[PDB]
């Protein structure tokens, strides 16, 4: 059983620079090194057969180097449709064997949320169930902390967030974030808010709504 | 022209079987080698069986020996994975990829130069259960803009996946479809759309909602109003 090992692991680029990606082997296996391409929600993609043979209808950006337990794929200029996941794969031995993948992501300037916050609907609300969402859009880089407040006091207890991969329009990243309360103790409580704290500021983004009506 | 195309995916118990299949074309099928490859939800790739341009000399992982059977119809050009007592860790999207030209040149190496779309398989006890579909309005008290976000929660389901357009495929641009998160058995995706606030009740923005395995549909109309 060959052990493939890539690095880097994740790795964010400024369109233009240049990278290299490695994928050690734990034994020989010569040329017997392919390198794929996996777009978001496509199939992987032959780019590289035998560590430097490419295939055809790629750039000539792609390079492929290696033998041994030793191989490199080198991207000389980051280019947006270029990011996706890099799969080395050896088929020297049965069974053939893959590494672990290279996730490239697109850095591009810092960016802050626009959020939006949504009381229960009135429909939800029959069913005896009550889910306040929050929208956290359009912002970079990925890392935003986001905490419920009931009434001013933080609420841990029943959320389930949900953050989109990169976009491939700009680079950003979007989330959302749900907490789940009973119509009964939804009824009970009388401000709903959504703290969001990012890079991109020091005072969390906050959004809120009082419960009332009709 | 190499078009490989897998159906046959779905939800099974633990301990039940499947059978999938992939459709050739573009090609002289019998003078390929294929294999089928499983992707995880934790995005890893896995090899999990070859079989010849003629037959005979099938190839397994250790995993996989004694459970799936790798089978090929030269004839009607279909790949198929027969798979059985299957185990939760089974879960994953099945792709039918071919290998390159092969010769008796003394053994050689076997790259995978075309992939298919993927089937996914779900290995669960859990049942289906078709998603409660909600509107999500925001309040017309005081919002910032010329736009407006409006969203709609699909909730309670099972199993992966659901379709969900806005004004039935019009409505393209301004929309974020968040990945679903299981929890307690079901899953719950949401979807949010930015129109500009003018077209704001006046318009109508409906979100549609398919869940293929329950065989349920819903439209459900927001029109951004007052609560």
């Known amino acids: 059983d060959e052990l493939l090992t890539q690095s880097p692991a994740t790795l964010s680029v400024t369109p233009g620079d240049s990278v290299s990606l490695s994928c050690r082997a734990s034994?020989?296996?010569?040329?017997?090194l392919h390198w794929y391409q996996q777009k978001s929600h496509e199939s992987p993609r032959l780019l590289i057969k035998?560590?430097?043979q490419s295939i055809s209808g790629i750039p000539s950006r792609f390079s492929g180097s290696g033998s041994g337990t030793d191989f490199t794929l080198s991207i000389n200029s980051v280019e947006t449709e270029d990011f996706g996941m890099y799969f080395c794969?050896?088929?020297?031995?049965?069974?053939?064997?893959f590494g672990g993948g290279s996730k490239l992501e697109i850095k591009r300037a810092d960016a802050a949320p626009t959020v939006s916050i949504f009381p229960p609907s009135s429909e939800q609300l029959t069913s005896g169930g009550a889910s306040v969402v929050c929208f956290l859009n359009n912002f970079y880089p990925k890392d935003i902390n986001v905490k419920w407040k009931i009434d001013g006091s933080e609420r841990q207890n029943g959320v389930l967030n949900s953050w989109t991969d990169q976009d491939s329009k700009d680079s950003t990243y979007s989330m959302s974030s749900t907490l789940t309360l009973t119509k009964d103790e939804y009824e009970r409580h009388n401000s709903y808010t959504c703290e969001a704290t990012h890079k991109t500021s020091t005072s969390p983004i906050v959004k809120s709504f009082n419960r009332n009506e009709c | 022209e190499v078009q490989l195309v897998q159906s046959g995916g779905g939800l099974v118990n633990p301990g039940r079987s499947l059978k999938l299949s992939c459709a050739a074309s573009?090609?002289?099928?019998?003078?390929?080698?294929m294999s089928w490859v499983r992707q995880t939800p934790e995005k890893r790739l896995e090899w999990v069986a070859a079989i010849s341009g003629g037959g005979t000399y099938i190839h397994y992982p250790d995993s996989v020996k004694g459970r799936f059977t790798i089978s090929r119809d030269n004839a009607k050009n279909n790949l198929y994975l027969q798979m059985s007592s299957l185990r939760s860790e089974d879960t994953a999207l099945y792709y039918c990829?071919?290998?390159?030209?092969?010769?008796?040149?003394?053994?050689?190496?076997?790259?995978?130069?075309?992939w298919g779309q993927g089937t996914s398989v779900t290995v669960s006890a859990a049942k289906t259960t078709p998603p409660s579909v909600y509107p999500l309005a925001p309040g017309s008290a005081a919002q910032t803009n010329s736009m407006v976000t409006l969203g709609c929660l699909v909730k309670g389901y099972f199993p992966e996946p659901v379709t969900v357009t806005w004004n039935s495929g019009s409505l393209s641009s301004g929309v974020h479809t968040f990945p679903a998160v299981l929890q307690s058995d079901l899953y719950t995706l949401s979807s949010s759309v930015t129109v500009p606030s003018s077209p704001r009740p006046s318009e109508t923005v409906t979100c549609n909602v398919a869940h293929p395995a329950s065989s349920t549909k819903v439209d459900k109309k927001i029109v951004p109003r007052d609560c």
């Open positions: 034994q020989s296996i010569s040329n017997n």
């Open positions: 794969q050896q088929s020297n031995s049965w069974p053939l064997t």
């Open positions: 573009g090609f002289t099928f019998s003078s390929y080698g």
């Open positions: 035998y560590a430097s």
């Open positions: 990829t071919r290998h390159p030209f092969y010769r008796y040149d003394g053994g050689n190496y076997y790259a995978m130069d075309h």
